[PDB]
Design a protein around this ligand. Structure first.
Ligand SMILES: [Zn+2]
Ligand SMILES: [Zn+2]
Ligand SMILES: [Zn+2]
Length: 178
């Protein structure tokens, strides 16, 4: 197994996947690493199993159809993994915790959002459809764009949104287009 956390790339108290070489801090893994369960398989392994049990799940889909899906166990898992993939980028640190807004010439967003709030929302099963999760994810970056305006710090929002969107297209097998 790896000697660093797959998500945050640091050493520490790590739990090791029994089916691949990755390791995680307890609360870096999503969901949080389970108390018992020997063997334990990580979320990367659980996602791989879904594609193996249904190879056709990787044929192209329309985003509109994906969004309307109910959050049954396999969609729930896919959203948890997509969220994990955003936390894997070091730039997620800017969007992890509850922000605040006091900038000359800007007003705060009507509906603030942040990655740890989405994490809690997923953990507490508050999303009934994929759409709920994706809307809040996209809201994070939209709020950032709007608030920071022409400051070059807006680019962080763009960069972390691009990570989200690529992973969304991959995980949910969105039909490739030009
Ligand atoms: Zn970690
Ligand atoms: Zn694994
Ligand atoms: Zn099948």
């Amino acid at each position: 197994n790896s000697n660093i956390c797959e998500v945050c790339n640091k050493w520490g108290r790590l739990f090791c996947c029994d089916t691949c070489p990755r390791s995680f801090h307890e609360h870096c893994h999503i969901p949080s690493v389970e108390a018992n369960k020997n063997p334990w398989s990580c979320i990367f392994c659980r996602i791989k199993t879904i594609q193996e049990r249904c190879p056709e799940s990787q044929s192209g889909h329309q985003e509109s159809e994906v969004l309307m899906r109910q959050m049954l166990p396999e969609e729930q898992l896919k959203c948890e993994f997509l969220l994990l993939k955003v936390y894997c980028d070091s730039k997620s640190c800017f969007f992890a915790s509850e922000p605040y807004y006091n900038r000359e010439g800007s007003q705060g967003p009507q509906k603030p959002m942040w990655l740890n709030k989405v994490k809690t929302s997923l953990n507490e099963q508050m999303y009934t459809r994929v759409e709920g999760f994706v809307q809040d994810m996209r809201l994070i970056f939209h709020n950032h764009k709007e608030f920071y305006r022409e400051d070059k710090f807006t680019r962080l929002g763009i960069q972390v949104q691009d990570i989200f969107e690529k992973n969304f297209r991959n995980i949910f097998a969105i039909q490739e287009t030009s």
